[PDB]
Design an enzyme around this catalytic site. Structure first.
Site, PDB file in Angstrom:
ATOM      1  N   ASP A  34      -0.403   5.690  11.634  1.00 10.37           N
ATOM      2  CA  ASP A  34      -0.211   4.277  11.309  1.00 10.37           C
ATOM      3  C   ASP A  34       0.995   3.717  12.063  1.00 10.37           C
ATOM      4  OD1 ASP A  34      -0.985   1.912   9.983  1.00 10.37           O
ATOM      5  OD2 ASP A  34       0.260   2.336   8.227  1.00 10.37           O
ATOM      6  N   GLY A  57       0.798  -1.212   0.000  1.00  9.77           N
ATOM      7  CA  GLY A  57       0.000   0.000   0.000  1.00  9.77           C
ATOM      8  C   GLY A  57       0.835   1.267   0.000  1.00  9.77           C
TER       9      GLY A  57
END
Ligand SMILES: NC(=O)c1cc(Cl)c2c(Cl)c(C3CC3)n(CC3CCNCC3)c2n1
Length: 273
Positions: free
Chosen positions: A134, A15
């Site tokens: 994240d 990603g």
């Protein structure tokens, strides 16, 4: 141009894009070369001008000044269909995820050193007005020679603000119950939740929660022997109510966090330097 850099093996892809090993030809500096396709880019930001760039570039520029436990952005380029980022690359290096895979649950002395360095890196980001969003073992690199950790991958991040966030593209099993239930969270308390997940991950060898229902319930079960002080800090970070969670100051003043090893000590004892 952009052959100031010799390209090596692919280091990883996902990603975050495709990341290659590289060397800056002008001084043989090790670098990582990260390619991101424009259409695959979700959150955008812009520089102190027009110049619309991936948010990742905006955020790294805001934190890449000075020394820190954040990977530094050395340069970036725009191509017709993609952006290319040049990042500093530790050598030798291993990400924390793979480190935990190979060694299992970490001794508390080592988890203390690692967790302390993560806290200092995250404080630096916040002080610079950047929220990572994240934080997790896959986004942490270990410089095995120096025992120093580096935070990577700001592609899900945002400018830090004091109002509510209603967007999130980070890793779900690290996201707080208030996001799961309400799709609303505030920056610091969400970050502290993810730090609780990370610390559990380090001392137990795996994350505490896999499913929405587990996150929402917030019951922490310890599968490995962990000290009461460590258990207490983790349960504090994982308080269901955001305002019941510790500030960074409270985490670093917690009894479990005292007497941390220096990075070089850490490498010599636990990473054999
Ligand atoms: N911004 C990024 O996504 C990024 C930035 C950097 Cl400096 C690196 C580095 Cl160095 C690596 C390889 C050394 C593992 N990787 C590949 C990752 C390491 C951690 N997760 C597995 C692939 C890097 N990725």
């Amino acid at each position: 141009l952009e052959s100031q850099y010799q390209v090596g093996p692919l280091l990883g892809s996902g990603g975050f894009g495709s990341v290659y090993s590289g060397i800056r030809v002008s001084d043989n500096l090790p670098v990582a070369i990260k390619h991101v396709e424009k259409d695959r880019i979700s959150d955008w930001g812009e520089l102190p001008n027009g110049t619309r760039v991936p948010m990742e570039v905006v955020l790294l520029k805001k934190v890449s000044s000075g020394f820190s436990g954040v990977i530094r952005l050395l340069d970036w380029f725009e191509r017709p269909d993609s952006f290319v980022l040049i990042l500093e690359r530790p050598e030798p290096v291993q990400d924390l995820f793979d480190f935990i895979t190979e060694r299992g649950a970490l001794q508390e002395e080592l988890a203390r050193s690692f967790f302390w360095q993560v806290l200092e890196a995250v404080r630096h980001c916040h002080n610079c007005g950047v929220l990572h969003r994240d934080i997790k073992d896959e986004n942490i690199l270990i410089d095995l020679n120096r025992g120093e950790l580096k935070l990577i991958d700001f592609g899900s991040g945002a400018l830090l603000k004091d109002t509510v966030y209603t967007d999130f593209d980070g890793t779900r099993v690290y996201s707080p119950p208030e996001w799961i239930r309400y799709h609303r969270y505030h920056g610091r308390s969400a970050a502290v939740w993810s730090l609780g997940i990370l610390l559990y991950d380090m001392v137990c060898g795996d994350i505490p929660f896999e499913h929405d229902e587990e996150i929402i319930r917030g019951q922490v079960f310890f599968r490995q022997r962990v000290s009461s002080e460590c258990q207490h800090l983790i349960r504090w970070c994982l308080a269901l109510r955001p305002s019941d969670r510790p500030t960074f100051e409270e985490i670093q003043n917690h009894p479990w966090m005292q007497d941390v090893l220096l990075p070089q000590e850490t490498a010599e004892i636990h990473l054999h330097s």
